[model samples]
Target: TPQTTDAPAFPSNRSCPYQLPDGYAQLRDTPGPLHRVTLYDGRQAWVVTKHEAARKLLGDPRLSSNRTDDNFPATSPFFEAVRESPQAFIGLDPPEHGTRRRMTISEFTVKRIKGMRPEVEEVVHGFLDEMLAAGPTADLVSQFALPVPSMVICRLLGVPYADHEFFQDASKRLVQSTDAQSALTARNDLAGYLDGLITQFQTEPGAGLVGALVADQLANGEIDREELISTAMLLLIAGHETTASMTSLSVITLLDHPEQYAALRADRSLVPGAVEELLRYLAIADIAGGRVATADIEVEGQLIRAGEGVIVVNSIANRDGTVYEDPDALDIHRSARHHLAFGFGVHQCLGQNLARLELEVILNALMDRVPTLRLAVPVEQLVLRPGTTIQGVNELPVTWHH
Candidate 1:
């Protein structure tokens, strides 16, 4: 693939915490919808910036999700390591992906997640109670945002919540580390930790998803121990990381827009729509849509030959002016459910229902308990986590009225 002289680098830095990277807007406006950009390693790949093009390409079977493919668009050493990890079905193509995905699909169904609302509510309020009792000021990311999802996923997966500090630390290093060595170390640590738990489940068979899989899949020889370990690792990391980022980002976005926050605080009914709009508006998992072409194909009139990488820029795609009115505005009332925040096609987020339920419960609890919640410092002071697959602040210092 000949690189265009003017091709800009992909995954440009965001100038503002709540906004997409400045370079994304220019790429979106470029001709042909599919624009070529150079990756961090100087490898050039096609980026789909429009909603229509992104949906078309992501849903197309011609684009492969297998990360081990020679041309897979690896954004960084950490991401490359992550994608290359044998994490159950996330990076597998077709039949195998479908089969493995179905094994755990029942856990995240809408009805199943809905049944979890009470437990989710308890978790949210438990943290809220502690945060409020601690004082008028606290780092919401650690105290509330991160733990809510981390604990919920722990309970759901039957991983001991007592080990959260261990896994969360390893997960942060794995996701945020730019160095391949450190990333691998973190990945191995996490895998080993889960392997021990799986071994325990093999004999005792505790509770939650892991135990259930052990009792059924592992017992019947449907999935081996290594497969269960990989699947558990994938769920453990994914179960918390993305939702944690979204929770932190959502809080900041809501506070940034005081009027919208006020409207939602006044009417609890808007929480669900507000969560969807926030997912669309923030689109924190910007790097979730990477793929490689398996065969020559024409997308939006551009010929993408086989063995080339393609990235569907979901963040900018959510901001596509054609699909959204006042695309940059945060309108909770907008019918934004069609947004590609969770992504598109067969590889779309399997835990979306659980994610949505968690967000809804977290947002509502915050409003009800901490109506006066406000940023403890200027928005510019908050540091965004750099180069991670998920976009979020390093910490969110928040204060509420006593």
Candidate 2:
């Protein structure tokens, strides 16, 4: 029992897989607007812990995602060190992220993505065939969930399935990356490869998403080669990992509450909402969002020094009582479009349309195809990845009635 029961006003003390703990979710809910506690990773970072606070920060232009700033904790007294370095829209000020985001945003528009869904569905069907033939036992995370997204991104990027092995291996290192150093290394390596990919398409048109970008990069005067590769790398890794992590985590959550699972099955349309809630609940990217405070500003009386890395603990914020009556209460019907799961503002996720399509296609197909899905062992018996940076199950041993 994660919750100790004298208190009914708040949710259970949910231990985060990330350093920034959701125990903040429990702590802030009890008769107070906000409070702070030491996190699981032993960091002293501030937790907004309320919905309004989250909205204020995310919507504010005063705080920035840029890494090249002053006062950022090269080391932390309470939490793990977030070594500063620019990495895509994850860390950049407006014109930078805004400019790069605009160059690539057109490719991922819903109309463009809708054309790919049928192809993605075919890929899903192909993978499901192998999964079913392998027998009643299947590991959805590896066989279906991971492979489907990876291959789709592969095809979309113009990379062949053969080279996918290299990028997929690289992505695992990135997702579990404990600190900024490992993340930077993985990103740099991928960028170099993407640069080579663009060159290939330049010499002779290559196959997937990279090819498309390369063609566009040559045609468009706005984007340069380096930025093109960086943005492309971001989309490929995102396509490879995020949806799989969400799907795996979402299935486990639904199993934890079978009543809710049944409700979803009763009205398949609830899935889109449920998926958003799942993203909010999982916050699998960890408590990783950071903004460089532009000035020596006092947010709610807490001094966030100029250039300091101010974090947005998505787990606590999404569960804030001020935003929803019972932030912890599972409401599949809850309005979640505003949740920062895919993030907010101009830096919101670019592949969101693609992610939504994958979620809808795979989740719908999985439930219909494997109605008896369940964890093969007790939930607690499984090993959770050591920290929360990119929280994922090392192996999801699942079985279903085929």
Candidate 3:
């Protein structure tokens, strides 16, 4: 039988105030630790609920991010997948992770992302045109937020614009689907696509990022073809997928709290800081982030042994009254340095800088174009996607004056 945490509804995508699916939030709010759930296929996993526990667990070197370790059971669903499909970033550990992460980190720096502002602004304005033409009841996900990130990633990776539809479909299946088999197939299709793109770059470097990187790699022989694809695969997948959710959800959340919306609209410069605060408040990926313990360590009054599994519950961690002075208070000026929304320590998301840039570009541009954005329906009527891994809205329709 699948055991669950008995608790009240908590504030998150699982049980978002906007769309509470019967009993979702209630299970988390009253929980004390990770809750083990059985999938429809009977696979089991844990959801971490404590903030400090997440911080300790994520930074613990003892814990293997690679699920196929000897410490993990052979029957584990995730481990089984890892051995067969190690092409994705989430499957690597140690020296391999360092190698891949180092190669990919520079592309996401402030300087690199700042350079994309012109192209990003163009995409933002194009999307804004559609949003304005639609008048009231514009679905922000499809119109404003969704296409922009994918386009940005496509430009950066040199993925052909003509094939954007295939990528969007493949990436959606990869991120939104929870069925293990479907997800695996989607992951493979995307990785395979990246491999093909990288192969093309090998013959003649294009004018974009993937081509430029491929040319450098060939010149230096610093990385292999497979490693090149893996790096591209990581950026293509993580680059836009998470931000898709962030873009839509942040807009919806702001519409719900008009005062915050007005506050930022009045001072356009506040948009960057506001994005960070929004990330902290929303905490999009609220569950299922994991790490392996490197050594026996004491964390949050509990002792964890080496070779044990560690799960992070950012939903609870960001809300921990003990961490932030006003844990529940959403402050736009918050520095966002202490945020675990992007994970903490060395493994902190390499893509955060780029994510911020993409968000700031769209958000700031939208405010400039449509300063009076508002929700099309009551917050209670929105549809929140299931699955704790990448919780987001299935749709976010809105209205604003142009």
Q: How close is candidate 2 to the true structure, as a TM-score?
A: 0.85
Candidate 3 TM-score, C-alpha based = 0.84
Worst 10 residues of 2 by lDDT: 73-82
Best by TM-score: 1
Q: Compared with the true structure, what per-residue lDDT tens digits does model 2 show for residues 212-233?
A: 6677655576677766676677
- Candidate 2, superposed: residue stretches over 4 Å from native: 1-22, 30-45, 73-86, 179-185, 207-209, 218-221, 301-303
Q: Which residue segments of model 1 deviate by more than 4 Å?
A: 1-5
Q: Taking the tens digit of each residue's C-alpha lDDT, what string does model 1 give over 1-402?
A: 985566688887776766877788788777676888889999999888898889999889999988877788988897667666765788878988898889898889888898999999999999999999988899998999889999989988999999999999998888788888889899899889988898899889799999999889888999878788889888888988889999888988888899999999999999999999999998888878889998998975689999999998898899888899988888999989679988898989988989999999999998888888889999888888764468888788888786
The per-model lDDT (C-alpha) reads: 0.87, 0.67, 0.68
| Model 3 lDDT at residue 234 | 66
List TM-score per model, in order: 0.97, 0.85, 0.84
Worst 10 residues of 1 by lDDT: 79-88
lDDT score, residue 55, model 1?
Answer: 91
Clashes per candidate, residues 3 or more apart or on different chains: 0, 13, 14
- lDDT by residue (tens digit), candidate 3, 1-402: 865543222323455633323343343354454554433334343445556666766766666676555544222343344456555455567777776677666667788878878878898888888778766668888776778888888877788878878878877876665556876787788778878877777787786667877888645887777767666776787766789889888887777677878888889789989988877777776543565556776654456667655556565567665566666666786665577788776567887887888788878877788777777787778777764446678677778654
Order of the predicted models by lDDT, top scorer first: 1, 3, 2
